[PDB]
Structure formats: C-alpha cells, structure tokens
Amino acid sequence: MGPCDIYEAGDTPCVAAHSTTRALYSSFSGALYQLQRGSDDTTTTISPLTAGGIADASAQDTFCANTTCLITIIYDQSGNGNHLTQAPPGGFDGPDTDGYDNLASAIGAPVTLNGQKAYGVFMSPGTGYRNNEATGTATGDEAEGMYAVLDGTHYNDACCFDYGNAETSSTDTGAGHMEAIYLGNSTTWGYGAGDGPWIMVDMENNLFSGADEGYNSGDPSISYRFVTAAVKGGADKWAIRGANAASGSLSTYYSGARPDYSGYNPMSKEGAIILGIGGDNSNGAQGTFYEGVMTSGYPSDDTENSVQENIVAAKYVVGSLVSGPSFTSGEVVSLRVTTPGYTTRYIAHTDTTVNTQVVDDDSSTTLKEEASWTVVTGLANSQCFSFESVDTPGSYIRHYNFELLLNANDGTKQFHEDATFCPQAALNGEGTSLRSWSYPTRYFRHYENVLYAASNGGVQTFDSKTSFNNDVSFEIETAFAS
Numbered sequence: 001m002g003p004c005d006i007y008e009a010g011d012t013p014c015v016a017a018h019s020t021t022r023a024l025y026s027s028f029s030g031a032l033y034q035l036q037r038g039s040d041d042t043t044t045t046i047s048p049l050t051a052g053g054i055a056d057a058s059a060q061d062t063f064c065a066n067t068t069c070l071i072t073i074i075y076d077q078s079g080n081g082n083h084l085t086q087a088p089p090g091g092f093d094g095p096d097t098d099g100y101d102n103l104a105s106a107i108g109a110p111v112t113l114n115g116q117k118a119y120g121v122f123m124s125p126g127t128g129y130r131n132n133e134a135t136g137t138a139t140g141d142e143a144e145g146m147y148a149v150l151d152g153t154h155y156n157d158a159c160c161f162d163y164g165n166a167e168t169s170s171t172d173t174g175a176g177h178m179e180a181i182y183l184g185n186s187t188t189w190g191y192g193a194g195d196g197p198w199i200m201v202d203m204e205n206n207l208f209s210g211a212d213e214g215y216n217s218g219d220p221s222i223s224y225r226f227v228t229a230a231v232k233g234g235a236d237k238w239a240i241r242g243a244n245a246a247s248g249s250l251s252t253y254y255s256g257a258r259p260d261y262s263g264y265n266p267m268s269k270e271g272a273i274i275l276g277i278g279g280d281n282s283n284g285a286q287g288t289f290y291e292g293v294m295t296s297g298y299p300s301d302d303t304e305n306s307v308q309e310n311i312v313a314a315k316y317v318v319g320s321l322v323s324g325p326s327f328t329s330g331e332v333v334s335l336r337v338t339t340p341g342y343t344t345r346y347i348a349h350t351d352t353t354v355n356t357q358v359v360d361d362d363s364s365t366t367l368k369e370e371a372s373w374t375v376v377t378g379l380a381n382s383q384c385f386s387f388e389s390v391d392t393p394g395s396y397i398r399h400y401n402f403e404l405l406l407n408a409n410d411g412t413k414q415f416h417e418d419a420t421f422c423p424q425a426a427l428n429g430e431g432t433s434l435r436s437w438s439y440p441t442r443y444f445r446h447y448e449n450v451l452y453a454a455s456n457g458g459v460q461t462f463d464s465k466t467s468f469n470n471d472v473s474f475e476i477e478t479a480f481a482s
C-alpha cells in the first residue's frame with residue numbers, strides 16, 4: 001500500500017496527491033509530472049517505472065540533455081484533477097511574466113528512493129504552484145488532514161513556504177481562510193523553540209506554532225534533511241506532528257482547540273491548493289517538496305503513523321548534485337569562455353563586478369589574480385563549490401539581484417547560499433556549467449561580457465535564450481596566478 005491507500009483504509013481518503021518522486025497509490029501508473037525544456041519549449045511527462053513505483057528519472061535526463069528543464073505541472077494522482085500548475089499573481093505579484101510565480105527547476109533536488117533515482121521540487125524565492133479550482137478539498141469548517149515530505153535544511157524566514165488549503169482568489173480574505181503546512185523560520189507571526197525551522201499551520205494572517213499567537217515553546221526546531229510534516233484540522237481542533245522522514249515516528253507538537261482569536265473557529269476554508277507560496281501569493285520563501293497529500297476528514301494518529309512508516313520505507317536519500325569535470329577543494333583555476341567570438345576571455349572581476357576579460361600570459365600580475373579562483377567546498381552545500389578570489393581572499397562570487405558580484409563572506413546562511421554553485425556537464429559539451437544551488441534555474445552566464453546568474457529564457461535581459469548554452473559553458477584551465 002502507498003500513503004493514499006493507507007489514508008483510504010483509515011477512512012480519510014486523499015482528495016489531492018502530489019509527488020515528483022513516486023506514486024502515492026500502489027496502483028498509480030499515470031504521469032507524476034510534466035517537464036518543459038528551454039531548447040524548444042516542448043514538453044513531456046514523467047511516470048512511475050512501474051505501478052506504485054518510483055519516477056522514471058532516466059526519461060527526464062534524456063529529455064533534458066544539453067538544455068534546461070522546468071517542472072510545469074505536478075499532477076494530482078487521486079483522479080480529482082487537482083493538478084498543480086504555475087501559480088498566478090494575487091495579493092502579491094510573482095517575479096515572472098504578468099505577475100506569475102516562477103516554475104521550479106527539474107534538477108534542483110535530486111534524490112534516490114530505496115536506491116532509485118528521482119527528482120524533487122526545489123523551490124527558490126519567487127517559485128510557486130497552485131490550483132484555484134480544486135475538487136474534493138475541505139471548505140468552511142470541514143475537516144482535513146495533509147502531509148508533505150520536505151527538506152528541513154532548505155528554508156528561509158520570508159512568507160511563506162506552504163502546502164495546503166488556501167483562498168481561491170489568491171488574496172488574503174481573512175483569518176480562517178487558509179489551512180496549510182508551513183516550514184521555515186519566519187517569526188513575523190508564530191514561531192517555535194530554538195533557531196528553527198518550524199512546522200507551523202498557516203490559518204491566514206497567522207502562522208501558528210501552538211494555541212497562542214506568536215511564540216509557542218511546544219513547537220521544536222526540526223531540521224532533518226528529510227522532514228515529514230503532518231497537519232490536520234477539524235471543528236475547533238487541529239494538530240502539528242513532525243518526524244524525520246528517513247527514520248522513526250511522528251511526534252505531536254500540538255493537538256488541541258483552535259487559537260482563541262476571532263475568525264479561527266469556525267474556519268472558512270476555500271479549498272484552493274497552494275505549494276511554496278502564501279494564500280495571497282506572498283512569494284519570498286524557499287523550500288523543497290518531494291511528496292504530499294490532502295485528505296477529506298480528520299486522520300487518526302494511527303493512520304498518520306502508518307503513513308510515516310511507509311515514508312520511512314521509501315528510504316529517501318540525498319542524490320548527486322554534480323556532474324561533468326568538477327573540482328577539488330583548494331584547487332585554483334581560471335575559467336574560459338567558450339562562446340564563439342569570445343573564446344579568449346576569462347571570468348574575472350573589476351572591483352565587485354564579476355565579468356569576462358581578455359587575460360593571457362602578458363597580463364599584469366594583478367589581472368592574472370583577478371582571473372584566478374580558489375575553489376573551496378560549497379559554503380551552503382558540501383557537494384557543490386564556492387569560488388574565492390585570489391587577489392581578494394575572503395571574498396567569493398555570489399549572486400545578488402541575479403548579478404554575479406565579488407563580496408566578502410559575512411558568514412551568514414544567506415551569503416553561503418548566494419555563493420554556492422554546483423558543477424554540471426557543460427550544456428554545449430565544452431567544460432562545465434555552474435548551476436546556482438539556491439536558484440537551480442540559473443547558471444553562471446556572461447552577457448555583454450558581464451557575469452549573471454541567468455536562466456534559459458526569463459524576464460531579465462540577461463536571461464536571453466540567444467546563445468544561452470554557449471554562454472553558460474566554461475572550460476576549466478590552469479590558474480593564471482599559477
């Protein structure tokens with residue numbers, strides 16, 4: 001049995017089931033999600049290898065070879081048609097065309113389930129999915145349960161990395177008009193103990209970590225690489241239960257009556273489904289979604305325990321984020337442009353601006369150093385890497401407003417994430433392509449001889465698809481600074 005077979009047996013059937021990694025029903029063999037590649041904007045679907053099995057990652061790799069891919073749709077496996085598509089603008093506009101939120105990269109969250117390769121949904125700030133015409137989802141004060149397997153190490157404090165029930169108008173219609181899982185360390189509303197992140201329940205105009213608005217000591221920080229967040233709500237009752245998705249049981253962080261504030265009892269759920277954003281489309285949060293469902297009815301603890309048992313059995317393990325030549329920590333290199341007509345240029349920097357310049361044996365000692373980089377273990381992820389300036393030790397290449405800058409490491413999580421890049425076999429076959437760890441839809445890309453963290457097509461001029469593949473491919477050579 002799969003998670004939804006378990007919920008069905010527990011008398012609280014799934015009304016929405018989403019996952020890019022595996023089938024959530026033992027009998028499901030349909031499409032798990034849809035992909036769209038940047039080379040020609042064509043699409044294709046990825047289905048389980050077998051009924052109730054793991055996604056066919058090989059099919060994705062084949063379709064996405066020598067180009068970039070986006071996850072356009074996360075299909076609803078229940079049959080209710082509650083598929084998740086690109087989230088629309090609402091109370092807040094997204095950063096994409098006409099206010100839509102960004103689609104997620106198809107390769108930002110590689111994993112293996114019991115040894116089989118699969119891809120999760122790595123969501124950077126601005127990314128979001130939604131379905132504002134869902135069927136079967138609880139409305140009003142109707143009871144529902146839900147869970148999601150997330151990455152407890154991928155999060156931030158901006159509103160709001162949610163998965164669950166929200167408004168069908170994509171706007172904030174008041175307290176009680178939402179009921180969704182939240183994972184992050186926002187403290188604007190509720191928050192738990194420690195540094196976070198915390199699993200909280202977004203009931204609109206409030207993220208709740210317990211009965212009181214604001215701080216609630218009963219909700220602990222949970223930072224497992226794979227987190228199972230289980231939330232449920234019914235008539236004047238709700239609960240938060242969490243666990244290490246890779247091992248053990250769910251622990252109850254909260255179970256009791258609704259927060260005693262106007263609008264939360266009875267609830268006024270609208271039934272829309274959101275992923276990675278807030279009800280009003282607040283889109284500043286980040287996180288990773290692997291699988292999750294929403295049910296009709298209030299799940300018993302026993303039913304959820306069986307679901308957690310199943311998740312553990314799926315055996316989630318982190319996958320490889322790197323491919324191609326790659327590097328070794330401590331190694332010093334110079335990166336050469338491969339785009340025809342700019343092949344004598346190297347990645348360098350003029351003060352804080354990262355750019356490309358013609359550097360050769362005749363260059364000054366200073367310029368040779370500005371075109372030389374010490375490759376160190378990724379500041380935000382040990383699999384990837386960070387690039388430290390040779391002339392300016394202590395400073396690394398980092399993206400800011402999608403421009404690559406050379407700034408001093410302040411030791412903060414944010415800097416670390418902005419400064420971590422994962423090597424990928426060059427899209428044009430020449431060398432390597434450095435993919436941003438925090439924004440996997442973006443890569444080192446030279447445009448007008450300046451370096452950016454650009455996507456294959458986008459709202460920024462430097463996201464131009466023209467010569468993208470060549471512009472994000474660099475040959476790794478001996479450092480000029482020796």
Ligand SMILES: *[C@@H]1O[C@H](CO)[C@@H](O[C@@H]2O[C@H](CO)[C@@H](O)[C@H](O)[C@H]2NC(C)=O)[C@H](O)[C@H]1NC(C)=O
Pocket residue numbers: 156157185186187188195196411412413414
């Ligand atoms: C959420 O967690 C992060 C990570 O611990 C906090 O970020 C730090 O941010 C402050 C404020 O900018 C800096 O003094 C620290 O140097 C940062 N620490 C790290 C480890 O990066 C963030 O402040 C937290 N947010 C809230 C609202 O509590």
